Design an enzyme around this catalytic site. Structure first.
Site, PDB file in Angstrom:
ATOM      1  N   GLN A  66      38.435  31.017  39.537  1.00  0.00           N
ATOM      2  CA  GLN A  66      38.075  32.407  39.689  1.00  0.00           C
ATOM      3  C   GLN A  66      37.490  32.899  38.392  1.00  0.00           C
ATOM      4  O   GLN A  66      38.156  32.853  37.364  1.00  0.00           O
ATOM      5  CB  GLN A  66      39.290  33.273  40.028  1.00  0.00           C
ATOM      6  N   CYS A  72      39.776  37.964  43.846  1.00  0.00           N
ATOM      7  CA  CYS A  72      40.903  37.073  44.196  1.00  0.00           C
ATOM      8  C   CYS A  72      41.249  37.026  45.681  1.00  0.00           C
ATOM      9  O   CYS A  72      41.619  35.970  46.200  1.00  0.00           O
ATOM     10  CB  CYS A  72      42.167  37.323  43.343  1.00  0.00           C
ATOM     11  N   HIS A 144      47.176  40.856  42.445  1.00  0.00           N
ATOM     12  CA  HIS A 144      46.539  39.538  42.482  1.00  0.00           C
ATOM     13  C   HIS A 144      46.943  38.776  43.735  1.00  0.00           C
ATOM     14  O   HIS A 144      48.102  38.793  44.112  1.00  0.00           O
ATOM     15  CB  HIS A 144      46.962  38.737  41.250  1.00  0.00           C
ATOM     16  N   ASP A 159      45.965  29.261  42.844  1.00  0.00           N
ATOM     17  CA  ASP A 159      45.635  30.443  42.023  1.00  0.00           C
ATOM     18  C   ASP A 159      44.411  30.162  41.125  1.00  0.00           C
ATOM     19  O   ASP A 159      44.503  29.366  40.193  1.00  0.00           O
ATOM     20  CB  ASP A 159      46.857  30.769  41.153  1.00  0.00           C
TER      21      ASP A 159
END
Length: 208
Positions: A66, A72, A144, A159
Protein backbone atom coordinates in the site's frame (compact mmCIF):
# COMPACT_ATOMS: atom_id res chain seq x y z
CA UNK A 1 -2.01 11.64 -4.04
CA UNK A 2 -4.69 10.89 -1.36
CA UNK A 3 -7.96 8.92 -1.35
CA UNK A 4 -11.24 9.18 0.57
CA UNK A 5 -11.64 6.33 3.08
CA UNK A 6 -13.73 3.40 1.81
CA UNK A 7 -17.20 3.05 3.29
CA UNK A 8 -17.15 -0.19 5.40
CA UNK A 9 -20.93 -0.70 5.40
CA UNK A 10 -21.49 -4.35 4.20
CA UNK A 11 -23.92 -3.34 1.42
CA UNK A 12 -21.52 -0.71 -0.04
CA UNK A 13 -18.64 -3.21 0.03
CA UNK A 14 -20.76 -5.74 -1.88
CA UNK A 15 -21.91 -3.25 -4.49
CA UNK A 16 -18.33 -2.01 -4.88
CA UNK A 17 -17.25 -5.61 -5.41
CA UNK A 18 -19.91 -6.19 -8.06
CA UNK A 19 -18.51 -3.31 -10.12
CA UNK A 20 -14.94 -4.54 -9.57
CA UNK A 21 -15.94 -8.04 -10.86
CA UNK A 22 -16.88 -10.10 -7.80
CA UNK A 23 -20.53 -10.76 -6.85
CA UNK A 24 -20.15 -14.16 -5.19
CA UNK A 25 -18.97 -13.03 -1.71
CA UNK A 26 -20.93 -10.98 0.82
CA UNK A 27 -20.18 -9.24 4.13
CA UNK A 28 -21.83 -9.68 7.56
CA UNK A 29 -21.13 -7.49 10.62
CA UNK A 30 -19.27 -9.02 13.55
CA UNK A 31 -20.80 -7.60 16.76
CA UNK A 32 -18.06 -8.93 19.04
CA UNK A 33 -15.43 -11.64 19.33
CA UNK A 34 -16.81 -13.75 22.21
CA UNK A 35 -18.23 -17.21 21.31
CA UNK A 36 -21.87 -16.22 21.76
CA UNK A 37 -21.59 -13.53 19.05
CA UNK A 38 -19.31 -15.44 16.67
CA UNK A 39 -21.82 -18.33 16.78
CA UNK A 40 -24.23 -15.86 15.08
CA UNK A 41 -22.10 -15.65 11.95
CA UNK A 42 -23.14 -17.80 8.99
CA UNK A 43 -20.54 -20.37 7.82
CA UNK A 44 -18.38 -21.19 5.97
CA UNK A 45 -16.52 -17.95 6.73
CA UNK A 46 -13.99 -17.23 4.01
CA UNK A 47 -12.20 -14.29 5.60
CA UNK A 48 -12.48 -11.55 8.18
CA UNK A 49 -12.05 -7.87 7.46
CA UNK A 50 -10.98 -5.74 10.46
CA UNK A 51 -10.91 -1.96 10.94
CA UNK A 52 -9.01 -0.30 13.80
CA UNK A 53 -7.46 3.13 14.52
CA UNK A 54 -3.81 4.28 14.02
CA UNK A 55 7.86 -19.56 9.02
CA UNK A 56 8.12 -16.91 6.25
CA UNK A 57 7.75 -18.24 2.76
CA UNK A 58 4.82 -16.53 1.04
CA UNK A 59 5.01 -18.29 -2.33
CA UNK A 60 1.31 -19.17 -2.27
CA UNK A 61 -0.14 -15.85 -1.01
CA UNK A 62 -1.00 -12.85 -3.15
CA UNK A 63 0.31 -9.66 -1.51
CA UNK A 64 0.18 -5.98 -2.55
CA UNK A 65 2.03 -3.06 -0.93
CA UNK A 66 0.00 0.00 0.00
CA UNK A 67 1.44 3.33 -1.04
CA UNK A 68 -1.71 5.55 -1.01
CA UNK A 69 -3.27 6.89 2.25
CA UNK A 70 -6.88 5.68 2.69
CA UNK A 71 -6.65 3.27 -0.23
CA UNK A 72 -6.62 0.49 2.45
CA UNK A 73 -10.25 -0.49 1.96
CA UNK A 74 -9.41 -1.35 -1.65
CA UNK A 75 -6.09 -3.01 -0.81
CA UNK A 76 -8.19 -5.24 1.53
CA UNK A 77 -10.59 -6.20 -1.23
CA UNK A 78 -7.54 -6.81 -3.44
CA UNK A 79 -5.93 -9.07 -0.81
CA UNK A 80 -9.29 -10.77 -0.36
CA UNK A 81 -10.36 -11.69 -3.87
CA UNK A 82 -6.76 -12.20 -4.96
CA UNK A 83 -6.34 -15.07 -2.44
CA UNK A 84 -9.84 -16.60 -3.07
CA UNK A 85 -9.39 -16.59 -6.86
CA UNK A 86 -9.45 -20.41 -7.06
CA UNK A 87 -12.64 -20.73 -5.03
CA UNK A 88 -14.61 -17.67 -6.12
CA UNK A 89 -13.59 -16.67 -9.62
CA UNK A 90 -13.81 -13.14 -10.95
CA UNK A 91 -16.02 -12.02 -13.80
CA UNK A 92 -14.04 -12.52 -17.01
CA UNK A 93 -12.69 -9.19 -18.41
CA UNK A 94 -13.74 -7.18 -15.29
CA UNK A 95 -11.62 -4.50 -13.66
CA UNK A 96 -10.20 -6.93 -11.09
CA UNK A 97 -9.78 -9.91 -13.43
CA UNK A 98 -7.77 -7.59 -15.71
CA UNK A 99 -5.72 -6.16 -12.82
CA UNK A 100 -4.81 -9.56 -11.32
CA UNK A 101 -3.79 -10.89 -14.75
CA UNK A 102 -1.72 -7.79 -15.43
CA UNK A 103 0.17 -7.90 -12.11
CA UNK A 104 0.30 -11.69 -11.75
CA UNK A 105 4.10 -11.82 -12.38
CA UNK A 106 4.84 -8.64 -10.37
CA UNK A 107 6.25 -8.30 -6.86
CA UNK A 108 4.16 -6.81 -4.04
CA UNK A 109 6.05 -3.51 -4.66
CA UNK A 110 5.35 -3.16 -8.38
CA UNK A 111 1.79 -4.38 -7.79
CA UNK A 112 1.36 -1.46 -5.43
CA UNK A 113 2.78 0.95 -8.00
CA UNK A 114 0.41 -0.44 -10.65
CA UNK A 115 -2.53 0.40 -8.36
CA UNK A 116 -1.49 4.08 -8.41
CA UNK A 117 -1.85 4.01 -12.21
CA UNK A 118 -5.27 2.25 -12.29
CA UNK A 119 -7.96 4.79 -13.16
CA UNK A 120 -10.85 2.30 -13.07
CA UNK A 121 -10.23 1.23 -9.50
CA UNK A 122 -9.54 4.75 -8.19
CA UNK A 123 -12.77 5.91 -9.87
CA UNK A 124 -14.85 2.98 -8.63
CA UNK A 125 -13.34 3.40 -5.15
CA UNK A 126 -14.65 6.99 -4.94
CA UNK A 127 -18.16 5.83 -5.90
CA UNK A 128 -18.14 3.72 -2.68
CA UNK A 129 -16.18 6.01 -0.36
CA UNK A 130 -17.40 7.93 2.72
CA UNK A 131 -18.77 11.47 2.55
CA UNK A 132 -16.48 14.50 2.81
CA UNK A 133 -17.78 17.76 4.39
CA UNK A 134 -14.34 19.05 5.33
CA UNK A 135 -10.67 18.20 4.82
CA UNK A 136 -10.62 16.06 8.01
CA UNK A 137 -12.77 13.46 6.18
CA UNK A 138 -9.99 12.83 3.62
CA UNK A 139 -6.84 13.99 5.46
CA UNK A 140 -7.68 12.16 8.69
CA UNK A 141 -6.20 8.71 7.95
CA UNK A 142 -6.92 7.17 11.36
CA UNK A 143 -8.86 3.89 10.74
CA UNK A 144 -7.22 1.03 8.78
CA UNK A 145 -8.49 -2.09 6.98
CA UNK A 146 -6.72 -5.40 7.25
CA UNK A 147 -7.81 -8.89 6.25
CA UNK A 148 -7.42 -12.47 7.43
CA UNK A 149 -7.77 -15.32 4.95
CA UNK A 150 -7.27 -19.08 5.25
CA UNK A 151 -4.52 -20.25 2.87
CA UNK A 152 -3.54 -23.92 2.93
CA UNK A 153 -4.83 -24.40 6.48
CA UNK A 154 -2.99 -21.30 7.74
CA UNK A 155 -4.54 -18.06 9.02
CA UNK A 156 -2.72 -15.33 7.06
CA UNK A 157 -3.03 -11.66 8.07
CA UNK A 158 -2.75 -9.30 5.08
CA UNK A 159 -1.77 -5.61 5.64
CA UNK A 160 -0.25 -3.41 2.83
CA UNK A 161 1.78 -1.27 5.25
CA UNK A 162 3.82 -4.26 6.45
CA UNK A 163 6.57 -5.70 4.26
CA UNK A 164 5.03 -9.12 3.96
CA UNK A 165 2.01 -11.13 5.03
CA UNK A 166 1.96 -12.22 8.68
CA UNK A 167 1.45 -15.99 8.98
CA UNK A 168 -0.37 -16.77 12.26
CA UNK A 169 -1.37 -20.39 13.03
CA UNK A 170 -2.90 -23.50 11.51
CA UNK A 171 -6.65 -23.88 11.41
CA UNK A 172 -9.59 -25.34 9.53
CA UNK A 173 -12.95 -24.36 8.03
CA UNK A 174 -14.93 -24.91 11.22
CA UNK A 175 -12.38 -23.08 13.41
CA UNK A 176 -11.23 -20.21 11.17
CA UNK A 177 -13.66 -17.52 12.47
CA UNK A 178 -12.85 -18.43 16.09
CA UNK A 179 -9.06 -18.76 15.77
CA UNK A 180 -9.18 -15.42 13.94
CA UNK A 181 -11.16 -13.78 16.78
CA UNK A 182 -8.54 -14.90 19.30
CA UNK A 183 -5.78 -13.43 17.14
CA UNK A 184 -7.69 -10.12 16.86
CA UNK A 185 -8.37 -9.94 20.62
CA UNK A 186 -4.76 -10.66 21.71
CA UNK A 187 -2.94 -8.80 18.90
CA UNK A 188 -5.17 -5.68 18.70
CA UNK A 189 -8.03 -5.33 21.21
CA UNK A 190 -6.58 -6.26 24.63
CA UNK A 191 -3.12 -5.06 23.51
CA UNK A 192 -4.68 -1.58 23.09
CA UNK A 193 -4.53 0.51 26.31
CA UNK A 194 -8.01 2.00 25.80
CA UNK A 195 -11.54 1.37 24.48
CA UNK A 196 -10.39 0.19 20.99
CA UNK A 197 -13.38 1.04 18.80
CA UNK A 198 -12.90 -1.50 16.05
CA UNK A 199 -15.26 -2.99 13.52
CA UNK A 200 -15.17 -6.38 11.89
CA UNK A 201 -16.86 -8.13 8.98
CA UNK A 202 -17.04 -11.88 8.13
CA UNK A 203 -16.89 -12.69 4.40
CA UNK A 204 -19.28 -15.51 3.46
CA UNK A 205 -20.64 -17.04 0.27
CA UNK A 206 -23.47 -15.13 -1.33
CA UNK A 207 -25.33 -18.37 -2.13
CA UNK A 208 -25.58 -22.15 -1.75
Amino acid sequence: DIWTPLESNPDSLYLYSCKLGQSKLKFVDIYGFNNDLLDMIPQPVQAVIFLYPVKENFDNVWFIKQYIPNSCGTIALLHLYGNLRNKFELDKDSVLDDFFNKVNEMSAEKRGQELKNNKSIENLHHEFCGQVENRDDILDVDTHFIVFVQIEGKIIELDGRKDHPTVHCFTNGDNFLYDTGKIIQDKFIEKCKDDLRFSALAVIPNDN
